[PDB]
Amino acid sequence: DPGDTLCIGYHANNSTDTVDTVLEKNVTVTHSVNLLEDKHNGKLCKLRGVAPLHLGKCNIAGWILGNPECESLSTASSWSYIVETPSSDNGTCYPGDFIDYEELREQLSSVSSFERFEIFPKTSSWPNHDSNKGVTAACPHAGAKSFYKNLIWLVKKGNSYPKLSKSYINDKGKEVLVLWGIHHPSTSADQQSLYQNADTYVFVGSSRYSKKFKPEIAIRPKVRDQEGRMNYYWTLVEPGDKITFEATGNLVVPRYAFAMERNAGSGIIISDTPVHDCNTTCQTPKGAINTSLPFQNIHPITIGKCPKYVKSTKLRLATGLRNIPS
Amino acid sequence: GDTLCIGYHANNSTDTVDTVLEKNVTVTHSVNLLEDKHNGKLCKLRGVAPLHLGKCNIAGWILGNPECESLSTASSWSYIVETPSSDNGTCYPGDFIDYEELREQLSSVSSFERFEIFPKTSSWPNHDSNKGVTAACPHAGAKSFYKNLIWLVKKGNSYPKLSKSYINDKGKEVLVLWGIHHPSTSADQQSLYQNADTYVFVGSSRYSKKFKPEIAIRPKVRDQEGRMNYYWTLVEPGDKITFEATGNLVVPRYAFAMERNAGSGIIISDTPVHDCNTTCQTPKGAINTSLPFQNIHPITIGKCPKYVKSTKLRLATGLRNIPS
Amino acid sequence: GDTLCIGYHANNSTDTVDTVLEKNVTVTHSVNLLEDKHNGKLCKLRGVAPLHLGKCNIAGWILGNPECESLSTASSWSYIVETPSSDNGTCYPGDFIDYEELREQLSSVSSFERFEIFPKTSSWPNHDSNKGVTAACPHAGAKSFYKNLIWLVKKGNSYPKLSKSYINDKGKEVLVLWGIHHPSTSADQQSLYQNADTYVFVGSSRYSKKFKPEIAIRPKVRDQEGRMNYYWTLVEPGDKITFEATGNLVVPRYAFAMERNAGSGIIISDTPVHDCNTTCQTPKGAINTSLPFQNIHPITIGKCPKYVKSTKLRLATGLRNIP
Amino acid sequence: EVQLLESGGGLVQPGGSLRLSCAASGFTFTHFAMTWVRQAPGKGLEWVSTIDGSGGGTYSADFVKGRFTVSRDNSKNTLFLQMNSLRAEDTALYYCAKVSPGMVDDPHLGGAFHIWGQGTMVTVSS
Amino acid sequence: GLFGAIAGFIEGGWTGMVDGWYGYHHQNEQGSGYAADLKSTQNAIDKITNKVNSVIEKMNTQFTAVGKEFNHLEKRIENLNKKVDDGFLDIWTYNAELLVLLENERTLDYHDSNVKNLYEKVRSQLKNNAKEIGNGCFEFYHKCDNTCMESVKNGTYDYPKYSEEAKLNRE
Amino acid sequence: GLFGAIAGFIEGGWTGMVDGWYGYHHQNEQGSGYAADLKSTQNAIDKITNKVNSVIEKMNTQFTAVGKEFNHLEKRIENLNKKVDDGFLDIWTYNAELLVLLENERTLDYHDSNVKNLYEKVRSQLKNNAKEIGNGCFEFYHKCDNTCMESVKNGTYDYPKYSEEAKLNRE
Amino acid sequence: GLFGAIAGFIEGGWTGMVDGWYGYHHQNEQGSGYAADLKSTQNAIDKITNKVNSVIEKMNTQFTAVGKEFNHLEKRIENLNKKVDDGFLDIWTYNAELLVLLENERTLDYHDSNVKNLYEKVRSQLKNNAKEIGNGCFEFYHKCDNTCMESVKNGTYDYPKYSEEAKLNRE
Amino acid sequence: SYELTQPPSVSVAPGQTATITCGGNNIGLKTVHWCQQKPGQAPVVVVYDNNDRPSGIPERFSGSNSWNTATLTITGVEAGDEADYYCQVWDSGSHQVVFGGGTKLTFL
Ligand SMILES: *[C@@H]1O[C@H](CO)[C@@H](O)[C@H](O)[C@H]1NC(C)=O
Ligand SMILES: *[C@@H]1O[C@H](CO)[C@@H](O)[C@H](O)[C@H]1NC(C)=O
Ligand SMILES: *[C@@H]1O[C@H](CO)[C@@H](O)[C@H](O)[C@H]1NC(C)=O
Ligand SMILES: *[C@@H]1O[C@H](CO)[C@@H](O)[C@H](O)[C@H]1NC(C)=O
Ligand SMILES: *[C@@H]1O[C@H](CO)[C@@H](O)[C@H](O)[C@H]1NC(C)=O
Ligand SMILES: *[C@@H]1O[C@H](CO)[C@@H](O)[C@H](O)[C@H]1NC(C)=O
Ligand SMILES: *[C@@H]1O[C@H](CO)[C@@H](O)[C@H](O)[C@H]1NC(C)=O
Ligand SMILES: *[C@@H]1O[C@H](CO)[C@@H](O)[C@H](O)[C@H]1NC(C)=O
Ligand SMILES: *[C@@H]1O[C@H](CO)[C@@H](O)[C@H](O)[C@H]1NC(C)=O
Ligand SMILES: *[C@@H]1O[C@H](CO)[C@@H](O)[C@H](O)[C@H]1NC(C)=O
Ligand SMILES: *[C@@H]1O[C@H](CO)[C@@H](O)[C@H](O)[C@H]1NC(C)=O
Ligand SMILES: *[C@@H]1O[C@H](CO)[C@@H](O)[C@H](O)[C@H]1NC(C)=O
Ligand SMILES: *[C@@H]1O[C@H](CO)[C@@H](O)[C@H](O)[C@H]1NC(C)=O
Ligand SMILES: *[C@@H]1O[C@H](CO)[C@@H](O)[C@H](O)[C@H]1NC(C)=O
């Protein structure tokens, strides 16, 4: 009243937001933005407007190989994830080593056009080799012995195994994945009684990929009631060249190839997180992230155009001034 | 009354910098930390002449492709130039095993004299050397082959067990290349090499592998149904390299005395080569700057700046330029 | 008169720091963030005694070299010490197949117990075990061979089809080691293993390979013209391993019950080993500091600081020192 | 020494048949690809058909139109040829030649005819 | 702080005000209440949101699969991936923590700067007419109505017209 | 800015002088024209060039071939290389673009501090002899020739010798 | 510096006192000697050592074996490891060097601001009673016995009590 | 498909260089097996490749395949060089053997 005071001050409110400075450690601020999003939607959802793939109780080996335990999934035409459960024990059923396994799991991760096409029809493409007598107890389906759907495990037909010759001139304009197998029996008697020839070679030329395979016949410790291994191989057929399957013996020749145009750049998420339909910029195994913020703490494994993983807990940027209520 | 105003200067400069608080602000002076200019010439790195293969790649120059005679190798080079259209490399179909790291090791060599471990005139008495030329490797019309390798044939009706060793006596890592031929048919296998089964053991004090043909009909590449698979090793300055084969061996006519100097890379560009003095070299163009950041190209060889995605990296050394 | 003149502390200190504006400015107090002191003694990390192979490397110690037996094998260690001059490793020439990543796996263990996976006394009835001695490993001037492996040779005039299995019953990853002999000539092959064709098969639930000799004369290395490639596998708890061989097999006398703990590295230095307690260790010397930046050595193992190329990272703590 | 031999037929009307053979001797027969070449009396040489050493993949000219098929028998060291005479223009001296080992490309087949067999007259006409 | 207005000679924040980050309080005979400046608060919040956007959008990433999958024969490569991911983890954690420890002493130093500069502009307009009583306030020496409240808040104070009243009251 | 010099009391730069970054304006009866302060401009441009040479020189590096070449069967290693290159790209872009956004603010704040401290130095030398108007202007209560122009610009001012004349003028 | 206190008007540090980083000198008729501010120096050392504990503690390094061993045939993976190590070395050296050249500058500007704010608080408590002479010194216009010494040093000053005594001075 | 064309006859003076040409498509990427035929004789090979000569055959017979034509470049003709000179090539594209009409050169 003696003087009309015109005090200068700063806004304060009832805010418990705390930020860490380089001088003090707990200070309260009026407003702040959280640069470390610590919230996930909990649903394995889309990137790029495209449904992520779900194998469920199946892995990439079982999916591509054609496991009768993960056929219930509906094949899509594009995906930015390959969802697997942490268990995923229903993959390769017959014991063996998937040769170049993680390379293939990395290649077929962001396919733009996946149309499984019957490269060699089971009805007509194999006249001289038995194709129905190739079921094993390693893949049981409905309690009866079965085998992979995308691969045919050829056996001697009658009493002889003719020198298989079969070529596929790629005429689809995109890379064609061809996955065959080589069977290594536990006993030379198994080799003779399954494939008439004993000194058996299998050559798979691609005009860029050349390699000859031979059996490793020896008794092994039992894995899933099978004493033999079955090595899986694959190659990328270029959109214009040929693939040649010359084989006088052990060969699980492919029923189905897989036409593919690779976007490249995505990976595999392994979680029991349920899949729903969403629209997200990033997805981790612990749940997706719909934020524009710079840093994220959810999971190290991040597939997408999404924030950098840190170990922080409070990356709170205090846009507002110091809150000192009185 | 008199006046003693304290102010800052302004000019007609229109250089713009961005701060955390305000972007697109003009400053009187500024220095560009982002070198966006390059001479556009693949000039000399360190102080020596970079190699230029022209219409060749490393798998064609080192093998001795007939289309690689134009290039000259005389002294140390800092990096290897390939045109992106360079397809005159391996002129016989096949995969060069251990290819990319051989490219990496051979990127920069301090002492490279292309000498002859086994002279073609005298080192192979009992084998036929003239017949090893192919229509898949033309030089000028007629069939030719690699100069640095000899692809052997049975002489008459026999391929004797080749056994010839090179005791390295030069004080430098002698780089050796050989080939193993995989015929399309077993008839080709026998009609080239008298032995049906042909091991090729190549030994050293450190490297030992046995090689066998993979005889089957491949799809045609360069009008050839067979592959020709290449190997290499580094002979140490004092050890031995034993070459043993009963067939399917492509012996080294010319080896390569080599001394690696700190390693470098390979630059693939259409850029012409001139003589300059550049500390850093990108495929788009050579840079001589001490400036910390660049945006020309990620793949860089030398004491190069860091590649960034920015377009305006200027330190605002002058004041805020507010004229009038 | 009278005054209260505000001033700032100065002293006789000569510590210099570098600000971005001005260089070599003196400050009253400074906290050094770049330690240049190392104790120069390879000492204990995580409270566990580091392994010392002395004049021996991982290949020699793991294969059972007759030169580096003097070391007392422990049950746990943080890292493996090798002299830069330690060359007593694979005495018989050859390529250790899968060498560097086995060294990576075997860098640190929680429970390492050497045990007789197949005792020499009784596990090989039909093969000659004493005859497998070579001049590549001399011990006290006499021909010997590895202690952890037996270089089996035909007993009498025949090499039977060696069948021998180990069902892992110890609950930890049993590390199994075998060698495959590649003779110099076919005469050596016949006089050693009696068979021209000899496959060696080592099966497991995740490992299966078939080995064959590469018989050819080689340049002499350590007075031997033949190679001895070493292979290995990690048998899982409860797993099985199967050794089948018609010849050219150097069977495991001793395997090693083993469990990994987060993996580690190998410290190669001339530094003596002493008893200490250090959070970080480098070949030059162990680093017991709580500071973020080091300059001693790039190759570091432990909860180590980050390596820089700097020499003066003095963080200013006190004021500008103008006396 | 390498001595390729001939056997043929004298005269057969168009619509008949006759047998040609090349009984090679003096070398390893299984591993060299045999041929057949003919010439009109006063005209340049023209090729009939090659065979593979394994007795498998066979190659033949364009004038045959599928009638002429060379067959290889490795066991008895003798080559066979099918003259199922259906046309009257096939008058020539029939030579069997041996393909020497080639040079890199097409080794078994694209090699010089170092050893040329002699010629057995085969004339067809009404 | 470094500029000494926030928690300096202005010790207490104001809970009555809602309009802006910075503001004034007037206790003239015509009224009372907290009233902010649109210009100062708007340009300050524009610069702060520009700062936050500089933290955010200048962090541009690409479509990268951070997860890599390795089998057991490649453990040197697996630990190389682990060292790459962990070194990126230490770099990004340390840079992010120290960026949010230094930029969060610079945002508060900037708010300190704005409060200090508002105080300096007030004493530059008011000159000797309004004594500085402390608490960030200005104890006037004339009966200044709401019109000159608006003039000081707008930066258009006319010093000579109240010179006579201020000099007679200052005695 | 933070210190309130550029766009604070003084808003417009001077196109007349190109002698230095900071300068004056003497308008005495003996002459006129702009004249830069030699010592402040020299030590400020020295510290600024030291800042630039610190940003440039401390980034000293060694001979590294950035580009690596991989085949088709090594695609995980190829994407590991791509992740290494892209992670270095994000680290270097977000610590050079954001570093430039920080250092540019620090440099214009250093220019703020130099102009503000030169202002404060002139206030300290002249004490109350001049009437502070803003824009760096000092309304002289004494007829100050070029000699006292030079003395104030140098840094030493004899206050008592002009104090009595300033008192009689401001009376 | 940026705030103009250390090496600004206050040109010299003081070796007489060791009690604290900041301090005073009293030339009272009762006694003499340098006497520090306990609270100011306490919060100063607390904040500075909090800077040190932040640059130390926020750098959290987990158990990583940096050394990896590669043979000759994997020279590409060896150079990839070398590029990873060289990139980490360049990043850590550049950020550590520039971090030191910026934290040193921030720490010294913090000491600038602490000395400057001590000066500002002193001229706020004494108001016009003190007479600024430069070098940070404050010449009084009254006796100001050791009680008045302690009152100014603590932070509470009774200006009206000595107002008349200072009114005797300056006519 | 693949065509070989040669001169019906080539004229040459005794002791002068005689050139015999087997033209056609790009015969450089193709092995030419030159062989002469005297009347009442079988083809005796004189150059069994691009450039190399068999034993028992005089040195003057030489061959040099080129971009489109093969040249049996005899350096000096004599009385024993009057014959029909055929050229034999194995066509890789169509898997054929194609001869030519040959050159009935006369030394006059
Ligand atoms: C703060 O107080 C206001 C009073 O209007 C109230 O609306 C608001 O909910 C309070 N905030 C909290 C976090 O309690
Ligand atoms: C800061 O606040 C946190 C969270 O409430 C509390 O746990 C901690 O004790 C406080 N003090 C420090 C020094 O971190
Ligand atoms: C699928 O997994 C179950 C256990 O979850 C196992 O019993 C079954 O045999 C598996 N089937 C195949 C085909 O792998
Ligand atoms: C984002 O997904 C939402 C959720 O269904 C949908 O409404 C929207 O169309 C999507 N945007 C696209 C696909 O561009
Ligand atoms: C994602 O978040 C934005 C705001 O950041 C919001 O507008 C949008 O609806 C959200 N979308 C989904 C699918 O949750
Ligand atoms: C800007 O001013 C400078 C200095 O007076 C002068 O040299 C130049 O011509 C002017 N104009 C331009 C476009 O740079
Ligand atoms: C800054 O100015 C440039 C002039 O080229 C313009 O392109 C850009 O859009 C401006 N940016 C903003 C944020 O106004
Ligand atoms: C060189 O490249 C050209 C262009 O494709 C190709 O036609 C030619 O066959 C190549 N020659 C060799 C010797 O590789
Ligand atoms: C730089 O290169 C130029 C051009 O080739 C040459 O003349 C000069 O000597 C070089 N300078 C040095 C210091 O090597
Ligand atoms: C690059 O080289 C030229 C010589 O052509 C030299 O004069 C110039 O200074 C160099 N550029 C820089 C930016 O140093
Ligand atoms: C500095 O002076 C102190 C006493 O103030 C004394 O203890 C110390 O030893 C001196 N330091 C040096 C380096 O002389
Ligand atoms: C051990 O190394 C020494 C040289 O250091 C060598 O002479 C000796 O033969 C080696 N012994 C074995 C068993 O390798
Ligand atoms: C460190 O090791 C020493 C060895 O002397 C031991 O006494 C001490 O207890 C250890 N410290 C801890 C915390 O384990
Ligand atoms: C490690 O350093 C700390 C801190 O200086 C010290 O207390 C401790 O004794 C040191 N330990 C050893 C073993 O040197």
Author numbering:
A (entry chain E): 8 to 55, 55A, 56 to 83, 83A, 84 to 90, 90A, 91 to 116, 116A, ...
B (entry chain C), C (entry chain D): 10 to 55, 55A, 56 to 83, 83A, 84 to 90, 90A, 91 to 116, 116A, ...
D (entry chain A): 1 to 126
E (entry chain H), F (entry chain F), G (entry chain G): 1 to 171
H (entry chain B): 127 to 234
Which text from the study accompanies this structure?
Three antibodies with low sequence identity to any examples in the training set and loop lengths opposing trends observed in ALL-conformations (long loop for rigid case and shorter loops for flexible cases) were selected. These were imaged in complex with the antigen and the heterogeneity in the density maps, indicative of conformational variety, was analysed. A potential limitation of the experimental setup is that antibodies were imaged in complex with the antigen. This choice was made as the minimum particle size required for cryo-EM complicates the study of free antibodies. For two of the three cases, the experimental evidence confirmed our predictions. Overall, cryo-EM experiments provide strong evidence that ITsFlexible is predictive of real CDR3 conformational dynamics observed in solution.
Furthermore, we used ITsFlexible to predict the flexibility of three CDRH3 loops with no solved structures and used cryogenic electron microscopy (cryo-EM) to experimentally determine their conformations. High-resolution structure of the three antibodies in complex with influenza H1N1 HA were solved. a,d,g, Top and side views of the cryo-EM map of antibodies (heavy chain, dark colour; light chain, bright colour) in complex with the antigen (grey).
